[PDB]
Amino acid sequence: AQNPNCNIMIFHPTKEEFNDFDKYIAYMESQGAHRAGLAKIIPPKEWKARETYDNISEILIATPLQQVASGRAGVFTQYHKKKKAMTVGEYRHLANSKKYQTPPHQNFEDLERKYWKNRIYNSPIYGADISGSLFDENTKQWNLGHLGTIQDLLEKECGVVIEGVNTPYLYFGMWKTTFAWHTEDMDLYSINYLHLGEPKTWYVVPPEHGQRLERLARELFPGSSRGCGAFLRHKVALISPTVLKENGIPFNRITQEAGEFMVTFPYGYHAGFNHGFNCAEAINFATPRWIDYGKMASQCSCGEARVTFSMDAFVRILQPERYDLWKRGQD
Ligand SMILES: O=C(O)CNC(=O)C(=O)O
Ligand SMILES: [Mg+2]
Ligand code: NI
Ligand SMILES: [Zn+2]
């Protein structure tokens, strides 16, 4: 069995290997990359996402989200308070202000220490989940707006034609902006490209051990767990590495820098934080190996998780027994 300790693997494809996206994902899996839940892909030196980022300041962040924490430093939830619209240039200036800017630090480890010590005492503003793309249309390799769609994959594997679309999302971050512990919708893959700015630190639980994280989460968030049998779908709970280690939960960590891709694999729980002003692009995708994960994915039916249009068909076809309850949660 390849990668039996479930380490995060880092790949350096050549420009030739960068042509065929599906083939390279399958390659990475042949080497055991999926066992970690997360892999890093460093693009060949010849590749670029676009020519420059000099002209992005007029993108609008219609609903910036202030991420307000409750709990203790290592075990907390966050809720998202909506803020007034602002442009990317206005948000960058805000991220760089004395109130929000990254503190002086020695290295990524010192910054990570400071994040876990101090995150809860601040409320950073995240421009998350913005439909759009920063890939140039002429970028033909690993262009996250030109991937094969999940609907087409389901149709190719299973023969059933379904409605829905699959487009990327932009994320504008600042120091301490946080992504809570989650797997993707329908336990899909994700791919995330850090276009510019400061790094993003990731934490991940191997898919084979995801239920250990869920059991810890039920213990640590007992009211939330009574409310919903899949409350991590709400994407609000944080647990620090120190707490994970104290509870024996297997995990790994890595820091993504600008110019690098990360892939999350089906049922790979992940969480993390931004180091400072940055911009990432991410999209969900599927492969043949995903189908079995999609069929088994948990679902929130309490009403909190509220998701895209396109998830309807995935539930309806892959999980017909759960469909009626899940759809009630949506309505
Ligand atoms: O970058 C973020 O805030 C969150 N991204 C992801 O969870 C992902 O790419 O799967
Ligand atoms: Mg612009
Ligand atoms: Ni994710
Ligand atoms: Zn729920």
Which residue type is seen at 162?
A: I
DSSP codes joined into one string, 280-326: EEEEEE--TTHHHHHHH-----SSSS---TTHHHHHHHH-HHHHHHH
Q: Which ligand is nearest to the CA of 194?
A: 1
Q: Is 67 in the pocket of ligand 1 (CB under 6 A)?
A: no
| Beta pairing, strands 189-197 & 261-264 | antiparallel
| Beta pairing, strands 9-11 & 38-41 | parallel
Does the domain at 1-331 match CATH 2.60.120.650? Answer given as yes
Domains of the chain, by residue range, sit at 1-331
DSSP codes joined into one string, 165-186: ----EEEEE-TT-EEEEEPPGG
Contact predicate 15/46, CB 8 Å = yes
CA 295 and chain centroid, separation: 20
Give this entry's resolution in angstroms: 1.4
Q: Is 179 in the pocket of ligand 1 (CB under 6 A)?
A: yes
Q: Which residue puts its alpha carbon closest to atom 2 of ligand 1?
A: 179
Report the sign of the C-alpha dihedral through residues 232, 210, 212, 325, in that order: positive
Closest C-alpha among 70, 176, 203 to residue 118: 176
Residue 227 CB contacts under 8 Å (≥ 6 apart), including other chains: 302, 304
Q: Is 34 marked as a binding-site residue?
A: no
* 183 Cα to the center of ligand 3, angstroms: 6
Tell me the best of 144, 191, 254, 264 to mutate to test the pocket of ligand 1, counting ligand atoms within 8 Å of each CB and taking the most: 264
Q: What are the strands of the beta sheet with 9-11, ordered from one edge?
A: 9-11, 38-41, 261-264, 189-197, 278-285, 169-173, 125-131, 65-72, 75-82, 237-239
d(CA 199, CA 181) in angstroms, rounded, equals: 18
Q: Which residue puts its alpha carbon closest to atom 7 of ligand 1?
A: 179
Contact predicate 186/256, CB 8 Å = no
Closest C-alpha among 310, 311, 287, 285 to residue 297: 311
CA 38 and chain centroid, separation: 10
The values of phi and psi at residue 137, to 5°, are -60, -25
Q: Given the structure tokens 């609008």, which residue do they identify?
A: 60
* 138 Cα to the center of ligand 1, angstroms: 25
Measure the CA angle with vertex 107, ends 104 and 112; round to 5°: 85
Q: Is 282 in the pocket of ligand 1 (CB under 6 A)?
A: yes
Which residue type is seen at 204?
A: V
Q: Is 235 marked as a binding-site residue?
A: yes
Q: Is 192 in the pocket of ligand 1 (CB under 6 A)?
A: yes
Contact predicate 290/156, CB 8 Å = no
Q: Is 170 in the pocket of ligand 1 (CB under 6 A)?
A: no
